[PDB]
């Protein structure tokens, strides 16, 4: 789960 339903990444962050 990421902010604003963003996409997860290998680094662990979220892509928006």
Q: Which two tokens stand for residue 13?
A: 């962050």
Q: Which two tokens stand for residue 12?
A: 């662990």
Contacts of 15 (CB under 8 A, 6+ apart): 2, 6, 7, 8, 9
Give the containing element (helix H, strand E) for 7. Answer: strand 7-8
Method of determination used here = NMR
**Using an 8 Å Cβ cutoff, are 10 and 4 in contact?**
no
Q: What are phi and psi of 9, to 5 degrees?
A: -130, 165
- Coil/strand/helix, residue 4: helix
Query: Sign of the C-alpha dihedral, residues 7, 14, 11, 1?
Result: negative
Q: What is the DSSP track for 1-16?
A: --GGG-EE-TTS-EE-
Q: Measuring CA to CA, how many Å separate 8 from each of 1, 5?
A: 7, 9
Q: Which two tokens stand for residue 3?
A: 């902010």
Q: Which two tokens stand for residue 11?
A: 């680094």
């Amino acid at each position: 789960w990421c902010a604003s339903g963003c996409r997860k990444k290998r680094h662990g962050g979220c892509s928006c």
